[PDB]
């Protein structure tokens, strides 16, 4: 399931 | 910076890059030994790169200086980003020249409508990633507190203010954090956070430098 990323959330911090 | 323009070479001589192997955050030189950045940009070791334009090309005119002290505001909180400000003391003083110089601290609070300049080497895309070699600049106005709060219900603290464009297209982004928002010749903001970058109704959120002027002075004095 390609939409289910294993990558950590970017989050809001810049 | 999304939707910006490449700054004139060395025209923002207070702009620094924080580097831990690669560029990861910005900062602003406020005295020969001190840099302002965002607390969430803390790392145990940081190299401050001053005088940069192209951060990929060693021109032979930069200054690369280890941080000796990296001091987060004592009331910074990672989870809320309240008080997202930090001071870096350089291990040797910066040499002040036409390409490396200080930005003045603010002498009044930020005010709605004020036209400012935001800068950095952060991502230039809202979707995906493109990290620029050359420093980017964005002209942007301070938004109202009401607009900021309406954009981010529940999330805007007294330390935070919004700058940018509610229509989207033009904003700071990842790896701009810590860098400056300059208005009328003074450092009014530190790049902090946002929901994505350059999206409609999700402007950038910045730390109000003015709230910290006494903290900055006191920290410098205590660490001299």
């Amino acid at each position: 399931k390609a939409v289910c990323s294993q990558e950590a959330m970017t989050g809001p911090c810049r | 910076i999304v939707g910006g323009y490449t700054c004139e070479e060395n025209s923002l001589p207070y702009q620094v890059s924080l580097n831990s192997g690669s560029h990861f955050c910005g900062g602003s030189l406020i005295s020969e030994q001190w840099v302002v950045s965002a607390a969430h940009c803390y790392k145990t070791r940081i190299q401050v790169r001053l005088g940069e334009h192209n951060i990929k090309v060693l021109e032979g005119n930069e200054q690369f200086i280890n941080a000796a002290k990296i001091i987060r505001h004592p009331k910074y909180n990672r989870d809320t980003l309240d008080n997202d400000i930090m001071l870096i003391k350089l291990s040797s003083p910066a040499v002040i020249n036409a390409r490396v110089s200080t930005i003045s601290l603010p002498t009044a609070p930020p005010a709605a409508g004020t036209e400012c300049l935001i800068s950095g080497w952060g991502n230039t895309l809202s979707f995906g990633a493109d990290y620029p070699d050359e420093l980017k600049c964005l002209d942007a106005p301070v938004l109202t507190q009401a607009e900021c709060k309406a954009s981010y219900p529940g999330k805007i603290t007294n330390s935070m203010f919004c700058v940018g464009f509610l229509e989207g297209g033009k904003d700071s982004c990842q790896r701009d954090a810590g860098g400056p928002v300059v208005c009328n010749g003074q450092l009014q903001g530190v790049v902090s956070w946002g929901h994505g970058c350059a999206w409609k109704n999700r402007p950038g959120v910045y730390t109000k430098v003015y709230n910290y002027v006494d903290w900055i002075k006191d920290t410098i004095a205590a660490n001299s």
Binding site: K1, A2, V3, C4, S5, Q6, E7, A8, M9, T10, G11, P12, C13 | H40, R78, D79, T80, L81, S126, F127, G128, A129, Y152, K155, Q174, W193, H195, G196, C197, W199, R202
Partner: protein, 38 residues
């Protein structure tokens, strides 16, 4: 149990994990979709 939301920059659902920078500032966009699929 596990929590997923859509990351606008990535165009995908991502897991919310404890301890992220600014975690309490997160916008959990399309949470019901991403839960359902992931």
């Amino acid at each position: 149990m596990p929590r997923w939301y859509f990351d606008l920059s990535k165009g995908k659902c991502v897991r919310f994990i404890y301890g992220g920078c600014g975690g309490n500032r997160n916008n959990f966009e399309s949470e019901d979709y991403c839960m359902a699929v992931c």
